[PDB]
């Protein structure tokens, strides 16, 4: 692994009055940080558990 898209890909929440759990891979950290996603306006840097986290941005 060498870093592709995901790691440097921006965190987006969206805007509607319910939030679902998410993790984004933080590029200057080297691990995933938690947030919550609303639904109405995200991207694709969102790992559903912290075990999916490492498969896009570490080579594991």
Architecture overview:
- With 60 residues, the chain is mainly beta.
- It has one domain (1-60): Pancreatic trypsin inhibitor Kunitz domain (Factor Xa Inhibitor, Irregular), CATH 4.10.410.
- Helix content is 7%, strand content 23%.
- The chain contains one helix and two strands; from the N terminus they run E-E-H.
- Strands 1-2 form a two-stranded antiparallel ribbon.
- A hairpin with a 4-residue loop joins strand 1 (20-26) and strand 2 (31-37).
- The protein is elongated.
- This is Kunitz-type serine protease inhibitor homolog calcicludine.
- Disulfide bonds join 7-57, 16-40, 32-53.
- It holds the Pfam family Kunitz_BPTI.
- It comes from Dendroaspis angusticeps.
- Fraction in beta strands: 15-25%
Tell me the name of the CATH homologous superfamily: Pancreatic trypsin inhibitor Kunitz domain
User: Which class in CATH terms?
Assistant: Few Secondary Structures
Instruction: Write the H/E string, N to C.
Output: EEH
InterPro entries: Kunitz_BPTI, Kunitz_BPTI_sf, Prtase_inh_Kunz-CS, TFPI/VKTCI-like
Domain BPTI/Kunitz inhibitor: 7-57
Protein name: Kunitz-type serine protease inhibitor homolog calcicludine
Disulfide bonds: 7-57, 16-40, 32-53
Secondary structure layout:
Blueprint: E1 20-26, E2 31-37, H1 54-57
Spell out the key features of this protein.
60 residues, mainly beta, two-stranded antiparallel ribbon, 2 strands, 7% helix, elongated
In short:
It is classed as calcium channel blocker. This protein is mainly beta.
């Amino acid at each position: 692994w060498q870093p592709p898209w995901y790691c440097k890909e921006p965190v987006r929440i969206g805007s509607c009055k319910k939030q679902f759990s998410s993790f984004y891979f933080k590029w200057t950290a080297k691990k995933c940080l938690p947030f919550l996603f609303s639904g109405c306006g995200g991207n694709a840097n969102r790992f559903q558990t912290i075990g999916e986290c490492r498969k896009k941005c570490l080579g594991k």
